User: Fold mitoribosomal protein BL31M, MRPL55 from Sus scrofa.
Amino acid sequence: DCNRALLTRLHRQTYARLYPVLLVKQDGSTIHIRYREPRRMLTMP
Assistant:
């Protein structure tokens, strides 16, 4: 059921290049975050 809303693109008329990034906050939890820095990962302290 988690997959209902997951497939989408940004609908704002003009925007920057969006790159998949993997974010790790301080959990052990990770989120897919679309951000303009191509770097494959960022981990939060």
